[PDB]
Structure formats: structure tokens, C-alpha cells
Amino acid sequence: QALLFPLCLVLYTFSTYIGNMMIQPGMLAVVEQYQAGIDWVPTSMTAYLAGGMFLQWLLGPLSDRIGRRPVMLAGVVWFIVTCLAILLAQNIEQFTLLRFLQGISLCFIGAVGYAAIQESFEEAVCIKITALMANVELIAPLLGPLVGAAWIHVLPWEGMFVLFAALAAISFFGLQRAMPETATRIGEKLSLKELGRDYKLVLKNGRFVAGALALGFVSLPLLAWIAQSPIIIITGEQLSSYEYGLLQVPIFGALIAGNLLLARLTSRRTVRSLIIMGGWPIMIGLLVAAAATVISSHAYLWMTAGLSIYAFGIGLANAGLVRLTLFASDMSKGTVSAAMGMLQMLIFTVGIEISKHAWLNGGNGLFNLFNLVNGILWLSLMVIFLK
Ligand SMILES: CCCCCCCCCCCC[N+](C)(C)[O-]
Numbered sequence: 163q164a165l166l167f168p169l170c171l172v173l174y175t176f177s178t179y180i181g182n183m184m185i186q187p188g189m190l191a192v193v194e195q196y197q198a199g200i201d202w203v204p205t206s207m208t209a210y211l212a213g214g215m216f217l218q219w220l221l222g223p224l225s226d227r228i229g230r231r232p233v234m235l236a237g238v239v240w241f242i243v244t245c246l247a248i249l250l251a252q253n254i255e256q257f258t259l260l261r262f263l264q265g266i267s268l269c270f271i272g273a274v275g276y277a278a279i280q281e282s283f284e285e286a287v288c289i290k291i292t293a294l295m296a297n298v299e300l301i302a303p304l305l306g307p308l309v310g311a312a313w314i315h316v317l318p319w320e321g322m323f324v325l326f327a328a329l330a331a332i333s334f335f336g337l338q339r340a341m342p343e344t345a346t347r348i349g350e351k352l353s354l355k356e357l358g359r360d361y362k363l364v365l366k367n368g369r370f371v372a373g374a375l376a377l378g379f380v381s382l383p384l385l386a387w388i389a390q391s392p393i394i395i396i397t398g399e400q401l402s403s404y405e406y407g408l409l410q411v412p413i414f415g416a417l418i419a420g421n422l423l424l425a426r427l428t429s430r431r432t433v434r435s436l437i438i439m440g441g442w443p444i445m446i447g448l449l450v451a452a453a454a455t456v457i458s459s460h461a462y463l464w465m466t467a468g469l470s471i472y473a474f475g476i477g478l479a480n481a482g483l484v485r486l487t488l489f490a491s492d493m494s495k496g497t498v499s500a501a502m503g504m505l506q507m508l509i510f511t512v513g514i515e516i517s518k519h520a521w522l523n524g525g526n527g528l529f530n531l532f533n534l535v536n537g538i539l540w541l542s543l544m545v546i547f548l549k
């Protein structure tokens with residue numbers, strides 16, 4: 163009867179992903195209008211990322227302290243505001259600011275949004291909702307840059323920010339009068355000292371952190387592409403929206419196929435084996451990705467095909483290694499997730515920034531090398547993590 167409330171959060175989830183996945187393809191348009199250089203294309207994703215790891219930590223225990231409903235709304239409100247208030251910044255210097263504060267609307271999906279389902283809805287109810295909100299995080303980056311390439315053709319870029327403010331409203335007016343709250347730390351002290359100290363406790367876990375990083379480093383070459391896949395292909399390789407959008411699928415369609423097997427071979431195998439099981443393609447992906455752009459700098463096909471091996475592997479391994487890294491520290495679920503979020507993004511954010519220059523002053527070579535760099539990193543944190 164009240165399954166309309168999960169779907170509202172499903173939508174808010176949906177919008178925040180495409181609100182980054184439809185934007186990166188159409189960032190070129192925005193750069194060639196605000197004027198700065200194609201080096202600002204990825205730097206969209208970057209500022210969108212670096213916002214999510216601002217109050218990531220503080221929103222969890224915070225949405226506990228003063229209700230889940232008013233803080234959640236303060237986010238859906240915060241989203242739609244800066245979804246239309248960025249249309250009236252018009253300069254690239256401060257497009258960032260409004261892109262960055264659109265990225266803080268990311269802590270709201272997990273530290274309170276996801277937490278509201280873990281508090282109210284029960285186990286088997288939570289399963290099918292999370293099985294859903296995992297496909298949102300898979301389909302909205304898969305098919306987003308595909309609508310984001312069929313949106314800059316029939317309309318301008320501006321049409322997206324209206325469409326998101328409105329879709330976040332289709333959820334918001336469905337959450338205006340249909341959002342019950344279940345925060346139990348109402349009327350509690352402004353205890354700020356306790357967070358840092360307790361996050362430093364999961365920071366002291368050389369098995370957890372080294373495992374939390376390895377999650378970042380591994381999933382980075384995936385996000386480093388997404389942020390740079392336009393200016394790699396559109397301006398870098400000089401290809402159209404149907405051709406560049408064609409190359410998003412063989413990659414993603416391989417990530418989906420690795421999430422197909424994972425959920426099927428979760429049974430006949432141990433979690434421990436799966437990571438090493440999905441590791442070989444990851445090794446071979448980033449292996450051959452860059453082992454392509456060795457002498458041939460512009461065989462993007464084999465790079466995209468290499469990021470299809472690597473992609474298949476992230477579906478299996480990366481996903482498994484999530485849980486073990488939650489349970490690598492026998493501590494709170496809220497503190498570990500926030501700790502591994504704020505770590506993964508720090509890898510993502512600052513990883514891309516390095517990934518960017520990697521592409522400029524090096525071209526495609528350096529870039530893929532500063533990909534396999536991360537496969538090496540992750541693997542190097544596996545010789546630690548298991549054996
Ligand atoms: C922020 C990028 C999320 C979409 C990419 C899907 C691959 C799984 C990455 C795991 C971390 C994602 N998250 C938001 C649950 O922390």
C-alpha cells in the first residue's frame with residue numbers, strides 16, 4: 163500500500179545519477195558557451211563528486227539527531243533549487259560552485275535516504291528495494307549518456323536541468339505529503355567530537371582502510387573514463403553523439419553482464435574466491451586497455467574493448483569486496499559506509515584530476531597507464547587483503 167514511498171527515493175536516486183550521466187556528454191556544449199577549455203569537461207564530475215564527500219560523514223548521525231524527514235527534504239529542496247539556479251550563473255568560474263553544491267545532494271541518498279529504509283522497512287522488504295536501487299546505480303549511468311546525447315540534438319543542454327528539477331519534484335510532491343520519519347536520536351546534544359574520534363577508529367583499521375581504498379582505486383578507471391569519455395571521443399577522437407554513445411554500451415553492457423553472473427554465482431562460490439575470480443579480467447582489462455595505446459595512440463576501439471574486460475570484472479569482484487570491507491571492521495554500519503564513502507570519493511575526485519592531466523600532456527597512453535596504475539594499486543592491496 164505504501165510502496166509508493168520507496169519509488170520516490172528510487173526516483174531521487176535515479177535523477178542524481180543521470181544528473182551527472184547525461185551532463186558529462188553535454189558538458190562540451192556548456193564549455194563551448196561558458197569558454198574555458200575542454201579540460202573543464204571532467205572537472206564537472208569532479209566538483210559533483212567532491213560535494214558528496216563533504217557532509218557524507220556528518221549527515222548520517224545528523225539525520226539521526228533531528229529527524230529523517232526534514233533533513234531529507236532539505237536535500238530534495240536543495241537539489242531542485244540548484245537544478246535551476248545554475249541556469250542563472252552563466253560563467254564557468256561559478257558554474258563549479260553550483261555544480262559542487264549539486265554534489266552535496268549525494269550524502270542525502272545514503273546517510274538518510276537509504277537509512278530510512280533500513281529503519282522502517284523490514285529485511286525481505288529491504289532486499290527487493292536495494293536490489294532495485296542497485297539497478298538505478300547501473301541503468302542511470304548506462305542509458306543516461308544515451309538520452310544525454312539525444313537531448314543535445316533535438317534541444318539545448320538547458321532542457322536537462324529543468325527536466326531534473328521537475329523529476330526531483332515528481333518525487334518531491336510525492337514526498338511532500340508521503341514521507342513518515344523514524345529517527346530516534348531526537349533531542350540529542352551537538353556532539354561533534356564523538357564523530358571524528360570514532361571515524362579515526364575505523365581509520366586505524368589497516369585491513370579496512372587498505373580495503374576501502376582498494377575499492378576506490380579499482381572503480382576509478384571506470385569513473386575516470388565517464389568524466390573524460392566525451393573529450394576522449396568527441397573532441398579527442400572526433401566522433402559523433404551516436405558513435406561516442408555507442409561506445410558507452412559495450413563497456414556498461416559488460417558491467418551489467420558481470421552483475422548478472424555475480425548474483426548467480428554468489429551461491430556456488432565463496433565471496434573470497436569471487437574477488438580473485440573477477441580480478442583476472444580486471445587485470446587483463448587495464449592490462450590491454452593501455453597495452454593497446456602503447457605505440458598506437460588512437461585505437462580507441464581496443465581501449466573501449468579493454469574497458470569492457472575491466473568492466474565485466476568490476477561487476478563481480480568490486481561488488482563482492484564491498485561487504486567484506488564493511489565487515490573488515492567490526493564496527494557500526496553508518497560509520498563504516500561513511501568512512502568508505504569519504505575514502506572512495508577522495509580516490510575518485512582527486513583521481514580524476516590526476517586522470518585529466520594524464521590525458522592532456524600524455525594523450526591516451528599516459529591516461530590508460532594512469533589506469534593500470536589503479537589495477538596495480540588494487541591488486542597490491544589484495545596480496546595484503548586475503549593472502
Ligand atoms: C558514484 C558512482 C556510483 C555508480 C557506479 C556503480 C559501481 C559501484 C560503485 C560502488 C560505490 C557506489 N556508492 C554510491 C554505493 O557508494
Ligand SMILES: [Pr+3]
Nearest residue numbers: 356357360494
Ligand atoms: Pr559513537
